[PDB]
């Protein structure tokens, strides 16, 4: 992984306060569950996925890591299709509007993350981020019956929100960026299953660099102005690179 290791300078405060949010939302209800959460290193992981984030922006990324692992654990008999989809639909419902008070705590937790994720972003970014979540939830149903259950894309999406920028949407959809994001997903997929595959990681990372060098040309093809060029650069270094490197340094 020829990418620099990076960690937010606010990582210590974020890790110290990481329990207040899942406790106030009923996701963690016992001191033993709290300790098990602390042992995951989830704020540490967020501080590496989002080194450019501090304060409330990094707390949102910590909550997202917190929520994902609390959520994934709910499928460790339910995870063996109908019962899986019954939970996912209740969570995914938060994307379409307010949840009923009867919704399980894990769904009110996602809704609180999603509410904070969208505020201040363009509606089109929200809609696209919402589709990524549905693909994530659909992946759990498909697994019960991997590029979607890993949840790399919503992690990447949060890096944009935590950095208060948006990569130009027409470059997000580009064949080049789509190939870069696929590498990020595959690399995260291989490193997690390990925790020949190492060669596949090395080959993909070498291809990742090749794809990175096309981005100056991609920017002109889509006629990026100055701000859009800087957003694309922030996306390359603070969202894609960080989701590739941060996962490795975490393990
Ligand atoms: C480490 C990792 C965990 C994802 O969980 P699993 O796919 O079930 O594997 P595991 O049982 O933990 O061995 C995969 C990569 C994680 C990320 C890219 C960030 C966490 C995932 C999110 C999805 F939404 C964060 F919200």
From Swiss-Prot:
Consequence recorded when altering residue 192 to D: 60-fold decrease in activity. 55-fold increase in Km for FPP
pH dependence: Optimum pH is 8.2-8.4.
Gene Ontology BP term (one): antibiotic biosynthetic process
Cofactor binding, note field: Binds 3 Mg(2+) ions per subunit.
Disulfide bonds: 118-126
A Pfam family per the record: Terpene_syn_C_2
Binding, Mg(2+) 3: 192
Domain of life: Bacteria
Annotated EC: 4.2.3.7
Effect of mutating residue 69 to Y: 20-fold decrease in activity and catalytic efficiency
UniProt function note: Catalyzes the cyclization of farnesyl diphosphate (FPP) to the tricyclic sesquiterpene pentalenene, which is the hydrocarbon precursor of the pentalenolactone family of antibiotics produced by a variety of Streptomyces species.
Protein name according to UniProt: Pentalenene synthase
Source organism: Streptomyces exfoliatus (Streptomyces hydrogenans)
């Amino acid at each position: 992984i020829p990418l620099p290791g990076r960690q937010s300078p606010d990582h210590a405060r974020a890790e110290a306060e990481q329990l207040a949010w899942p406790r106030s939302l009923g996701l963690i209800r016992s001191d033993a569950a709290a300790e098990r959460h602390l042992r995951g290193g989830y704020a540490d992981l967020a501080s590496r996925f989002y080194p450019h984030a501090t304060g409330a922006d990094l707390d949102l990324g910590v909550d997202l890591m917190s929520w994902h692992f609390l959520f994934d654990d709910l499928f460790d008999p339910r995870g063996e299709p109908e019962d899986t989809k019954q939970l996912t639909d209740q969570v995914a419902a938060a994307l379409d509007g307010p949840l009923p008070d009867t919704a399980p705590p894990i769904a009110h937790g996602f809704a609180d993350i999603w509410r904070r994720t969208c505020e201040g972003m363009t509606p089109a970014w929200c809609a696209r981020s919402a589709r990524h979540w549905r693909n994530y939830f659909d992946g759990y149903v498909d697994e019960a019956e991997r590029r979607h259950t890993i949840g790399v894309q919503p992690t990447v999406d949060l890096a944009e929100r935590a950095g208060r920028f948006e990569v130009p949407h027409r470059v997000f959809d580009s064949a080049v960026m789509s190939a870069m994001l696929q590498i990020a997903v595959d690399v995260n997929l291989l490193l997690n299953d390990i925790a020949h595959m190492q060669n596949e990681v090395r080959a993909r990372l070498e291809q990742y660099l090749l794809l990175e060098s096309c981005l100056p040309k991609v920017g002109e093809i889509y006629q990026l102005d100055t701000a859009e060029r800087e957003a694309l650069e922030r996306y390359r270094t603070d969202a894609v690179r960080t989701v590739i490197r941060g996962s490795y340094d975490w393990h």
